């Protein structure tokens, strides 16, 4: 326009208010293209995310907007920092796309999953992680997509969550579109199209912590359906009570699978894979495993909770109300958007929600 300017990013264009000078791509995602840059003003590198198809349709919107609001409305030492949100076009008419700006962390949790660690560090990172989750949760908001590529860290040993596109509240009914929530970390209730509650997020933190110990992915499916086969082979077939909770159709297939005993957590996770247990109590392989086996549980009903997790013998070693009990973020109630408003009506809420902030 005159203060903005496009650059050559991937097979696409990038228009950012000049102050954001020095664009280096770093994130290719169904979420949007993301690259780091140096803010000439803030004088510190930042992260620019371009909303890949904001109004490509009814869903993109409901999420484009869902993130904006949630980036804004939520402040916590462990939830990514919102620094801005600008747009190039000038009129609602021309309103084409929106770029968000959030602080920039050093590396990824993938990067972490590629290095040994010690009880102290691993323990703490899972803490910080459970902290940012207690936050979203404490206000009825669910992330539903906690994979490593959505967790960022730093040389000072800190962690912050990311992408809130899928972030929403209460699954009044099965995730009709889990197609999005990444396979490897999909939760049973999501796989078997049930209905998700708060703790679904805790299942993810299960796979995630398991991946940090194994150094490889836990439930390596080869397709949306084979995913179940890896969950049962390790953890074992679900009791009948659970099977009575499945929709009449999923039930059959699920009960027609071979039966699986499953291995115990002292097998899936042998000591040798856990940090060098030192003489001390709080931080021990055994407790690391106990927490693990309380998240990696098919039945949500019987699955741990963030408050409980934040209170476990391996996490509670650095508890502090100022982080674990922190005040829930307050939404103006904008999430009224369950009501799928038309693309246009959508583009209304969007561009403007964009606007002012």
């Amino acid at each position: 326009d005159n203060n903005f300017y496009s650059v050559e990013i991937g097979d696409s264009t990038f228009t950012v208010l000049k102050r954001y000078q020095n664009l280096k791509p770093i994130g290719s995602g169904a979420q949007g293209i993301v690259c780091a840059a140096y803010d000439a003003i803030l004088e510190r590198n930042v992260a620019i995310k371009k909303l890949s198809r904001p109004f490509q349709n009814q869903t993109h919107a409901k999420r484009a907007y869902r993130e904006l609001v949630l980036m804004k409305c939520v402040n916590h030492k462990n939830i990514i920092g919102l620094l801005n949100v600008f747009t190039p076009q000038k009129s609602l008419e021309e309103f084409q796309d929106v770029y968000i700006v959030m602080e920039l962390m050093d590396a990824n949790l993938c990067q972490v999953i590629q290095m040994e660690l010690d009880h102290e560090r691993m323990s703490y990172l899972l803490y910080q992680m459970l902290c940012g989750i207690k936050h979203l949760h404490s206000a009825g908001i669910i992330h539903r997509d906690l994979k490593p590529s959505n967790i960022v860290v730093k040389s000072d040993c800190t962690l912050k969550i990311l992408d809130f596109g899928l972030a929403r509240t209460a699954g009044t009914s099965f995730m009709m579109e889990p197609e999005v929530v990444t396979r490897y970390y999909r939760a049973p209730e999501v796989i078997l199209g049930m209905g998700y509650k708060e703790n679904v997020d805790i299942w993810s933190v299960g796979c995630i912590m398991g991946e940090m110990v194994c150094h490889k992915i836990l439930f390596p499916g080869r397709d949306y359906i084979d995913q179940w086969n890896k969950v049962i082979e390790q953890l074992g077939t679900p009791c009948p009570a659970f099977m009575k909770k499945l929709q009449p159709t999923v039930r059959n297939y699920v009960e027609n699978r071979p039966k699986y005993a499953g291995y115990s957590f002292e097998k899936l996770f042998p000591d040798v894979l856990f940090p060098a247990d030192s003489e001390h109590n709080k931080l021990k392989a055994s407790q690391a495993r106990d927490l693990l086996s309380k998240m990696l549980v098919i039945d949500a009903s019987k699955r741990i909770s963030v408050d409980e997790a934040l209170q476990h013998p391996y996490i509670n070693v650095w508890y502090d109300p100022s982080e674990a009990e922190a005040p829930p973020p307050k939404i103006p109630d904008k999430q009224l958007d369950e009501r799928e408003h038309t693309i246009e009506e959508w583009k209304e809420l969007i561009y403007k929600e964009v606007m002012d902030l």
């Binding site: 990067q111 972490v112 290095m115 102290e120 560090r121 703490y124 730093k154 040389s155 040993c157 650095w318």
Partner: peptide, 10 residues
């Protein structure tokens, strides 16, 4: 039992 301060990611 203090919180870590460094995380060699490099």
């Amino acid at each position: 039992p203090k919180r870590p301060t460094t995380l060699n990611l490099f």
